[PDB]
Scaffold this active site. Sequence first.
Site, PDB file in Angstrom:
ATOM      1  N   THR A   1       0.822  -1.205   0.000  1.00  0.00           N
ATOM      2  CA  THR A   1       0.000   0.000   0.000  1.00  0.00           C
ATOM      3  C   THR A   1       0.857   1.257   0.000  1.00  0.00           C
ATOM      4  OG1 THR A   1      -1.872   1.108   1.063  1.00  0.00           O
ATOM      5  CG2 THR A   1      -0.253   0.082   2.514  1.00  0.00           C
TER       6      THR A   1
ATOM      7  N   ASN B   1      17.653   0.483   5.942  1.00  0.00           N
ATOM      8  CA  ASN B   1      17.653   0.220   7.378  1.00  0.00           C
ATOM      9  C   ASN B   1      19.041  -0.126   7.905  1.00  0.00           C
ATOM     10  OD1 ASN B   1      15.104   0.745   8.457  1.00  0.00           O
ATOM     11  ND2 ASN B   1      14.265  -1.198   7.712  1.00  0.00           N
TER      12      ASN B   1
ATOM     13  N   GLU C   1      17.322  26.356  -3.383  1.00  0.00           N
ATOM     14  CA  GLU C   1      18.774  26.229  -3.499  1.00  0.00           C
ATOM     15  C   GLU C   1      19.252  24.848  -3.064  1.00  0.00           C
ATOM     16  OE1 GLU C   1      20.799  30.202  -2.087  1.00  0.00           O
ATOM     17  OE2 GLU C   1      18.615  30.326  -1.916  1.00  0.00           O
TER      18      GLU C   1
HETATM   19  N1  LIG Z   1      12.583   2.955   9.333  1.00  0.00           N
HETATM   20  C1  LIG Z   1      11.425   2.343   9.551  1.00  0.00           C
HETATM   21  N2  LIG Z   1      10.892   1.503   8.593  1.00  0.00           N
HETATM   22  C2  LIG Z   1       9.711   0.877   8.815  1.00  0.00           C
HETATM   23  C3  LIG Z   1       9.031   1.078  10.007  1.00  0.00           C
HETATM   24  N3  LIG Z   1       7.898   0.346   9.970  1.00  0.00           N
HETATM   25  C4  LIG Z   1       7.844  -0.304   8.790  1.00  0.00           C
HETATM   26  N4  LIG Z   1       8.962   0.004   8.064  1.00  0.00           N
HETATM   27  C5  LIG Z   1       9.280  -0.490   6.712  1.00  0.00           C
HETATM   28  O1  LIG Z   1       8.084  -0.820   6.029  1.00  0.00           O
HETATM   29  C6  LIG Z   1       8.282  -1.973   5.241  1.00  0.00           C
HETATM   30  C7  LIG Z   1       6.990  -2.759   5.051  1.00  0.00           C
HETATM   31  O2  LIG Z   1       5.861  -1.914   5.002  1.00  0.00           O
HETATM   32  P1  LIG Z   1       4.808  -1.946   6.217  1.00  0.00           P
HETATM   33  O3  LIG Z   1       5.479  -1.511   7.494  1.00  0.00           O
HETATM   34  O4  LIG Z   1       4.253  -3.337   6.382  1.00  0.00           O
HETATM   35  O5  LIG Z   1       3.651  -0.891   5.834  1.00  0.00           O
HETATM   36  P2  LIG Z   1       3.342  -0.422   4.324  1.00  0.00           P
HETATM   37  O6  LIG Z   1       4.573   0.155   3.673  1.00  0.00           O
HETATM   38  O7  LIG Z   1       2.243   0.609   4.359  1.00  0.00           O
HETATM   39  O8  LIG Z   1       2.822  -1.716   3.518  1.00  0.00           O
HETATM   40  P3  LIG Z   1       1.584  -2.610   4.026  1.00  0.00           P
HETATM   41  O9  LIG Z   1       2.135  -3.734   4.859  1.00  0.00           O
HETATM   42  O10 LIG Z   1       0.861  -3.198   2.838  1.00  0.00           O
HETATM   43  O11 LIG Z   1       0.641  -1.784   4.865  1.00  0.00           O
HETATM   44  C8  LIG Z   1       9.328  -2.790   5.979  1.00  0.00           C
HETATM   45  O12 LIG Z   1      10.187  -3.436   5.069  1.00  0.00           O
HETATM   46  C9  LIG Z   1      10.094  -1.773   6.798  1.00  0.00           C
HETATM   47  O13 LIG Z   1      11.372  -1.576   6.244  1.00  0.00           O
HETATM   48  C10 LIG Z   1       9.561   1.919  10.973  1.00  0.00           C
HETATM   49  O14 LIG Z   1       8.960   2.097  12.029  1.00  0.00           O
HETATM   50  N5  LIG Z   1      10.762   2.551  10.742  1.00  0.00           N
END
Ligand SMILES: Nc1nc2c(ncn2[C@@H]2O[C@H](COP(=O)(O)OP(=O)(O)OP(=O)(O)O)[C@@H](O)[C@H]2O)c(=O)[nH]1
Lengths: 61, 436, 439, 71, 430
Positions: C145, C206, C254
Site C-alpha cells: 500500500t 535500514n 537552493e
Molecule cells: N525505518 C522504519 N521503517 C519501517 C518502520 N515500519 C515499517 N517500516 C518499513 O516498512 C516496510 C513494510 O511496510 P509496512 O510496514 O508493512 O507498511 P506499508 O509500507 O504501508 O505496507 P503494508 O504492509 O501493505 O501496509 C518494511 O520493510 C520496513 O522496512 C519503521 O517504524 N521505521
Amino acid sequence: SKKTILSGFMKNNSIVGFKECLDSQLQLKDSKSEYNDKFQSKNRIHRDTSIFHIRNKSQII
Amino acid sequence: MREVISIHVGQGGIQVGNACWELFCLEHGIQPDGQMPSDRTGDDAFNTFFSETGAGKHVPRAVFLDLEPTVIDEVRTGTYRQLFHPEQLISGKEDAANNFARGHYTIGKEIVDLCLDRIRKLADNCTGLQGFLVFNSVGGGTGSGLGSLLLERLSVDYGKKSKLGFTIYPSPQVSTAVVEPYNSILSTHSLLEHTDVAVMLDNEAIYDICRRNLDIERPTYTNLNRLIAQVISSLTASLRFDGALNVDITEFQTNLVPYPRIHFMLSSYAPIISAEKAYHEQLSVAEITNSAFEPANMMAKCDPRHGKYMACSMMYRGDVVPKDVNASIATIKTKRTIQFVDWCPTGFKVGINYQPPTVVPGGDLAKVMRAVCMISNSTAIAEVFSRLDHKFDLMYAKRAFVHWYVGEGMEEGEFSEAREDLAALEKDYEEVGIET
Amino acid sequence: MREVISIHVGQGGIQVGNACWELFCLEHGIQPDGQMPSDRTIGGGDDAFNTFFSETGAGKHVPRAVFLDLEPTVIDEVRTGTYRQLFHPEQLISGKEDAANNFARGHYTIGKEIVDLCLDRIRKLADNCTGLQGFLVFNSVGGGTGSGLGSLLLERLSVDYGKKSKLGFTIYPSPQVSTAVVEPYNSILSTHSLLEHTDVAVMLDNEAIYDICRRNLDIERPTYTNLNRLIAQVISSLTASLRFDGALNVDITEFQTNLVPYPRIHFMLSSYAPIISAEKAYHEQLSVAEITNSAFEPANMMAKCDPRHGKYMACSMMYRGDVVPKDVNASIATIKTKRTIQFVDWCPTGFKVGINYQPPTVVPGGDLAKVMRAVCMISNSTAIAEVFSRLDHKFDLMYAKRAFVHWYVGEGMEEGEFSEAREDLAALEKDYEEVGIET
Amino acid sequence: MKRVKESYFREHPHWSDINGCSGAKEFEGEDLAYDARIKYQKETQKQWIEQQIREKKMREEAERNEERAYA
Amino acid sequence: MREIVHIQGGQCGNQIGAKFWEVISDEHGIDPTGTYHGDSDLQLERINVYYNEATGGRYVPRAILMDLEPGTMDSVRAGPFGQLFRPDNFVFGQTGAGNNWAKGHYTEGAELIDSVLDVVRKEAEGCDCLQGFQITHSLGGGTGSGMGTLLISKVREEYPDRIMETFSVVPSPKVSDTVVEPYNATLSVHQLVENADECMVIDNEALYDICFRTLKLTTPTYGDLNHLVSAAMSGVTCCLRFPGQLNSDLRKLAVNLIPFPRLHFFMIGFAPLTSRGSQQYRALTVPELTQQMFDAKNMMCAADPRHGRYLTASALFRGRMSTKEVDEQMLNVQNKNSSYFVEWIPNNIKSSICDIPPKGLKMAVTFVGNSTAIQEMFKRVAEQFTAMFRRKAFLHWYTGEGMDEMEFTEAESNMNDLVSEYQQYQDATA
Ligand SMILES: Nc1nc2c(ncn2[C@@H]2O[C@H](COP(=O)(O)OP(=O)(O)OP(=O)(O)O)[C@@H](O)[C@H]2O)c(=O)[nH]1
Ligand SMILES: Nc1nc2c(ncn2[C@@H]2O[C@H](COP(=O)(O)OP(=O)(O)OP(=O)(O)O)[C@@H](O)[C@H]2O)c(=O)[nH]1
Ligand SMILES: Nc1nc2c(ncn2[C@@H]2O[C@H](COP(=O)(O)OP(=O)(O)O)[C@@H](O)[C@H]2O)c(=O)[nH]1
Ligand SMILES: [Mg+2]
C-alpha cells in the site's frame, strides 16, 4: 405599550399639528409696534456724531 | 413596510415551516405565545414576517394547507397553539393518497377557494408586499396537486407579484414511494411556467451533508428542516437587517434568470461544521467560500463540474469586509476547476448583512460569526431531469399504475404532454450551454 | 509566509511522521494539546512556527500534514495517542482493507477510493498556504500500500500542480536483511514510477542506521523509534534554515539549483554528524573539522553504500550551532586537499554550504547527546548504482521462474510491467556509468 | 435597507470627534485595534466551543440511559 | 454670489454626498445644529455659496436627496450631521429600481422625477446669481444611473447656460458586484456625453489601490473611499470660496481644459497623501507635491496615464506659497516629459493659487487632467457589453419595459464612436 393605549376620547380632544408654534418664531414682542420704534424713542438735543467703518463686509439679509 | 407571505402546503411544507417559524420567532425574540419575552424589558424589524394585532401579540404572515387532519391537529395541540390565527391552519378531511389527479381535480377544488379567501385576506393588509414563498413536497399527491392549483390561481389573481418555490424532488435512487415520478413530472409541468424562481432541495444531498460534516449517524427530518430554515433565513435577512450591501427579493430574478424559461437553480450553505471540530479551523471568508463552492456541499444531488455556470448569487452575514470578498471572488475566478459560460464575463452578485446567524437550542450547528449562502444557476442541473425521465419511461411503457390516475377524472394525454414538456425543458439547457 | 506540506503514507511513513512532528512541536514549544504556552522565542522572530504550523484562528495550532493508510491500526493508535488534540480529525484518512504487500492492490484496485479524498485534503491545505515551498513525502517502499499509494499520489500531483517541487525520503530494502519476501517486485515497480515524477529522492535503507546505532550510540537493542528519531533529526537539520536566521540561508530552491546536474539523476545519499552518546562526549572536543571528517568517512553514510567506489558529483552540507564561515572554509579546504575522496572532472567546485545559528534540540528519553555543533550532508555520487544493480540481480533471480506473479496479473496489473521496469533500471545504471567517465 | 453602521464593529463617530478630516490625515481605516480585537475574539469563540461540547455530552448521556432502561 | 446647488442620487450617491457635507461643514466651522462657531470672516464671508440662511440664524445646505427606495435616506439621518438637510428635500419611491436601467429611466423614475424637478426649480430660482449644478451618482446601478441621467437631460433643457458638473463612479471588471453591470453602464454614457459639461470618472478599483499602496491602511471600507472622493470634490471649488493670487471657478476650468465639445471626461487626484509611519520622512514643499501629483498610481481611475498623451491639465494649489516656484515646476515637468504631452498645443497646464489651505494642512493641490488614455475604461466596458449582448443574455427585462434593441445598438455605436474619435487626437501630428 406603543399603540395599545389608544382610546376614542383621547384622540378627538387632542391637537397634533396646531398646538403652540415653537421657539425661533416667537421672537416678536407684541407691545412694540410702529410709531413706537422711532417716534417713541427718546430723542436728543445734542446727539452723538461718532461713526465707525469696520474692515468687515456687511452681512446681507 | 415590506412583507413576504409564506405558503406551506403538504406534510413536508408544514414540517419545514415549523422549523422556519421557530427560527424566526427565536431570532426576533418573540415567545411561542406570540409576545415580547415577558416583562423583562422595538426596532420594527419583525414587520417583514409579523404584524402587530393592535393589542399585544404578533401574528405570522403564513398559511398552512393540508388534507390530512393529523399534522394540523397535532400542531394545534403543540406549544405553538397560541401563535397562529385559528383559521389560518386550514385542514381537509380526506387525504389525496399520493394521487396527483385527486388533489388536482377532485378534493383540492373544495379547499382552494377558502385558501384564496385567506390569502387575499392576508394580502390586503400589507402595503409593500415583496412577494410569495411556497414550500411543498413534489413526490406527494396533495402536495403537488394543491401547489399546482394555488400557483395557477395566484398567477391569474395577482399578475406581476413574484413567487419563489422551494421544491423537493425525489432523490436519484433513494426514496419512500413507488409512484412519485408521475406526480413529479406533472407538478414539473405545472410549475415550469408558473413559478419565477425554483430552488432544489433534494433530501439525499442533505443526508450526505449531515453524515459528512455534523458526524451524525442517526439523522431525521428535523435536521434537514433546520438546515432549510437556516437557508431561508440567510436569504431573507437582507430584507429586515442593516447591511453594507443590500439585495432585495426583486434583485434575484433580475440577476439569476438569463431567460424566462430557465429559472431552475440549486443552493449551497457554509460553514456546516459540528461543534466537536467547529472552530479548530480559522473560518476565514476564503475557506468558507471555498467550502460553499465545493461540489460535495451542493444542497441538491448534482455535480456542477459537469456543466457551465450561468450566474451566482452569494450573501455573507456576519462581520465580513468587501475587500476580503473581492479577494475570494478573484481566487475563485482564477481557479480552473470552475468554468463559466462565455457570454457571462462577470457572474457574481454579492450581498453583505451584519446580522450574525442565530442558534437554536437542541440544534446541530455551531455559533458562527461568519456564514455564506450561495445560490447558483448552472447547466449541470439537467442530469436530475434526465435520470427522472428515465425512471418514468420504464413504468409508463406498461401502463403501470395508470388506471389510478385515469379513474380520477384525468385525461389520458396528460402524461404524453408532460413528457414533451420535460423534453423541451431539457432542450433549452443544452442549447444555451454550448459556445457560440 | 514560507510553508511546506509533509506527506505520510504507509506504516513506516506514519511512524516516521510521529517522531518528526514530536520533534517539531518540542522545538517550537507547542504543547501536545495544541495550545502554545506562548513566549517571545529565542531566534528568528515569532514567525518561526509558520513554516510547519498554521494559526487556527481560535487558540490552538494545526500541523500542515496529512496521514494516509489502508490498515487502520496505526491511524487508530495515533488518534488515541498523546496527540489526539493536535491533528485535525478529518486529515487522518484511513481505509478498511490493507493492500497485503501487493503493489497491484495498492495501485489499481483500492487506491482510487482514497486518492480523491487525499487530493481534496491537499487542495484545501494548499489554499491556506501563500508561499508554499514544496511537498515532502515519506513512504516505505517495501510495503504494498505504501509504494502503490505513493506512486499514484505522485502521478496525480505531477499533473495537478506541476511547478511545485516535491521531495522524497524513501527507505529502500536492505541488501540482505529484509522482513517481507516479495518486496523486490514492488520496489522495482515503485522505482519505475518515481524516477519520472520525483524531483529529489533520498535513500534511507535500514542496515546503515542499524549499524550506526550499534556502533556509535552503544545501544544493543534499540527499535524503530530511534531510527525515526534519527530521520527526524535529519529532516530538522535540513529544514532549519527556512525558519531560523543564519549567516548563510539556503532555501528549498537552493538544492535543485546546486545538486542535480541533470533531471535524470536525482538520487542522493545523506549523512549526519556528530552523533554519539553522552557517555563518550566527555572526552573529545567536537570541532568542525572532526565532525565534517566523521560526516565524510564512509561508515557514517545513512545509506548502505560505499562512496569510495564512485565520484562525488555534488555535495550539500548544512551546519547548525556556533559554526563560523572561516572554520567551515578550513574544513572544506582540508577535505579538498585529502586524496582519498575524489570529485568528478567537470565539477571544479562541488560544495553548497549553509549555516544556521540554532543548536540542535533534544528529545526526552533520547540517545543523542545535546551538542553545540552539528552538520547534515547531502551528497550526489555515482556510487549509487551498486544498490540498483544489487536489487536488479535480486529481482532477476526472483523472476527467473515466474513466482508470485499470479496475484499481480489477477489483480489487474498486466504480467510484463516488470520487463519495462527492468529496462528503465538498466537505462539508469547505464546513465550513471556513462556520466562518471572522464572527458 | 439602511446603512447605519460604518462597519460591523465601530459605529459612526460623534461630531466632536471629527475635528479635522477636511485635510486627509485621519482615515480611521488603520484600525489601531485589529490585534486586540482578533485576540479577544479567539477566546470569545473558545468559550462557545466548550459550552456546546458540554451540552452535546449531556445529550449523549441522556440518550444512553434510555437504552439502558429498555434493556 | 455665483453659488451652486448640490444633487445626489442613489445609494452610492447619497453616501458620497453625506461624507462631502461633513467635510464642507467642518471646513466652514458649522456644527450639526447649523450654528456657526468658526474663527474668521473668510469662513463666513462667502458661506452663501453652499448654504441657505433661515430664521434663527441657522444655515441649511441646498442639497437635494433623491432615490427610488426609502431605506438609504432613513440611514443618512442616522449618521453624524444627518439633521442638517431640510426634510422637504427628501424624495423617495416605495419599490426601488433593482439594478434595472429601464425601470429607473422609463417606468418608475419618469413618474417620480416630476416631483424632484419642482424642488430643483425652487432652489435654482431662489438664489440670486446661479453658477451651476454638481451631481454625484454611480453608473453601475439602476436608480443612480437610470433616473439620475434623466434628471441631467431634463435640467439641461431648462438651464442651457449653466455649468453642469458630474462625478460618475464607472464600474470596473476587477471589483465586480453585479452580473448586469455592463448593460446599464454602457447606456448611461450615451446620455452623459450629450449633456454634462464636465464629467469626472471615478473607479472603485483605483481607490482601493490608493488605500492599500499609498496609505497602507489595514482595512479599507466605503467610509475611507468616500473620504478620498470628498476631499477631491472640495478642492475643485476651493478658490470659489476663498481669496487667492489667481482665482479660477468652474467655468474657467472648462474653457482651459476642453478643446472640443465632445471631449469632457477627466481624471482627478489628490495630494499630499501619506501613511502614518511615513509622515516624518517626507518634506512638504511645492516640488514634492507636483512629483506625487503626476504619478500614475495616484490617479482615481483605472486608466494608466502613461499609455496615452495628455491633452490639457489643471492644478489648483492651496496655501500660502510663492508664485515663481509654482510656475517653474509646471514648466519643468512639461519639458522633461515631452513625449507624454500632445505637441500642437503649447503650455497645456493651468495653475491656480488659493491662500487658505485645508484645516490642519499647510499645502495641498488637486489635479484635473484630460488624457487620451481614458479610452481604456470604455474599451473594457464595451467588450463585456458585446460579449453579453451577442447572445441576448439578461435582456427580457429591458425589452419588457418598452425599450427596443435599436436603443442598445445605437448606444453601443455612439460609445464606440466616442472611443474612435477620442483616439484620433492621440495620433494627431503638427
Ligand atoms: N525505518 C522504519 N521503517 C519501517 C518502520 N515500519 C515499517 N517500516 C518499513 O516498512 C516496510 C513494510 O511496510 P509496512 O510496514 O508493512 O507498511 P506499508 O509500507 O504501508 O505496507 P503494508 O504492509 O501493505 O501496509 C518494511 O520493510 C520496513 O522496512 C519503521 O517504524 N521505521
Ligand atoms: N425534506 C423533507 N421532506 C419531507 C418531509 N416530510 C415529508 N417529506 C417529503 O414528502 C414526500 C411524501 O409526501 P408526504 O410528506 O408524506 O405528504 P404530501 O406530500 O402532502 O402528500 P400526501 O402523502 O398525499 O399527503 C416524501 O417523499 C418526502 O420526500 C420532511 O420533513 N423533510
Ligand atoms: N465609492 C463608493 N462606491 C459605492 C458606495 N456604495 C455603493 N458603491 C458602489 O456602487 C455599486 C452598486 O451601486 P447601487 O447600490 O446599485 O447604486 P443605485 O442603483 O443608485 O442604488 C457597487 O458596485 C459599489 O461598488 C459608496 O459608498 N462609495
Ligand atoms: Mg402526506
